[PDB]
C-alpha cells in the first residue's frame, strides 16, 4: 500500500479503538493497524532513498515498526481475551510510539 494509506490506517483506527464498546471492534481495528505497520516496515521512506539498508537510519526505521507491532500484539491479545478496556488502555501507547519512532522518517525530501 501507499505509505500515506498505511500512516492513516494507524491514525484513524486509534479512534475506532477509543470509541469501541465491544471486543470485536477493538480486534478489527488492531488487526488493520498490524497489517499497515508490517506493510510500511517493508517500504523505503522518501528521506531514506540515498541510504543503504544497513544504515543506522534504515535499521532504526525498520525496528521502530517492530516496537509498534509488538505493542499492537499486546493489545490484540487482551482484546482476544475479551478485556476491552484493558486493550483500549494498552492501545494508548501506540500514538506515543508512532511519534517517537516513526514520524521523523516521513518528512519530505
Amino acid at each position, epitope marked *: 500500500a*501507499d505509505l*500515506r494509506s498505511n500512516w492513516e490506517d494507524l491514525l*484513524f*483506527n486509534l*479512534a*475506532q479503538i477509543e470509541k469501541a464498546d465491544n471486543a470485536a471492534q477493538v480486534k478489527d481495528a488492531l488487526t488493520k493497524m498490524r497489517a499497515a505497520a508490517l506493510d510500511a516496515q517493508k517500504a523505503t521512506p522518501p528521506k531514506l532513498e540515498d541510504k543503504s539498508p544497513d544504515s543506522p537510519e534504515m535499521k532504526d526505521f525498520r525496528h521502530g515498526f517492530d516496537i509498534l507491532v509488538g505493542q499492537i500484539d499486546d493489545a490484540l491479545k487482551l482484546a482476544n481475551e475479551g478485556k476491552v478496556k484493558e486493550a483500549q488502555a494498552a492501545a494508548e501507547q501506540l500514538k506515543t510510539t508512532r511519534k517517537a519512532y516513526i*514520524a521523523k522518517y*516521513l*518528512a519530505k525530501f
Partner: antibody
Amino acid sequence: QVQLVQSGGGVVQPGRSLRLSCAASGFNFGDFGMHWVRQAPGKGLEWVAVISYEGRNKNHADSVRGRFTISRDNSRNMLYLQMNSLRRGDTAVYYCAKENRDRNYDSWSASYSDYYYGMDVWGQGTTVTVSS
Amino acid sequence: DIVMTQSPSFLSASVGDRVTITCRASQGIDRYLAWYQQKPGSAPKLLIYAASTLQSGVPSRFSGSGSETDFTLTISSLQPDDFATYYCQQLSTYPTITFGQGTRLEIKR
C-alpha cells in the same frame, strides 16, 4: 480558483434521509482530507465528519455516528454526506471544508504537514431543516 | 472528547483597542489548535493554526500563542472588519476534532 460549491439540502421530515454534495475545483481534490461541519440556528460550529484523501479511512462525531456517512468520489471531485434517520436536532447549515496543509510543506509529510493545521477552504453552506 | 472552553463569551471593544481572547482545553493538546473568524451569513475563515502560525492573507495584527492547555488570540489594534465571532478548534485527537463555543466581539459605545 480554489473553491468548494455545495448543493442539496432543504426541508426533510424526521426519520427520513438526505444527501449533501460538495463539488471541488481549482486544486488536487484527492490529495486532501475533507470535513463536514455544521452550525445549528444561533449556535456554534460543530464538527461532523472527516474522510481521508483516498476515501478509505473516515470518522464521525458521536452525535451522528451510525446515521451519517461521509464519502467521496475523487474522479468527479465530489464530496458527499449521506444523512439517514434525521432528527429535528440535525437542523443546521452544513459546511464542507478542505483540510489545510502547513505552508512550509508543498506535499504530504504525515503529521508535520497535514491533519493538525485546521481547514483552509470552506463551502458556502447548505441549510437543512428537519421538521414535520 | 476534549472540551474547549473560550472566555469571555462576549466582549466589547473600540477601533484601535488591543483585544485578547482565551481558549482552555480539558487536557493537553500540545500546539494543535486553530482559530477561526465568522461573520453572520458566511463561512468560517481560518486565521491561525499550530497555535501561533498566521494563515496566508490574514492581516499581521492577528496573532496567537499558548501551549499544552492555555491559548490566546490577540488583535493588536482593531479594525471595523474584525467585529465577528471567533472559534478555537483542537485537532490533537485527530480524527476527532472539537470546537470551542465561540467569543463574540462587539462594538462598544
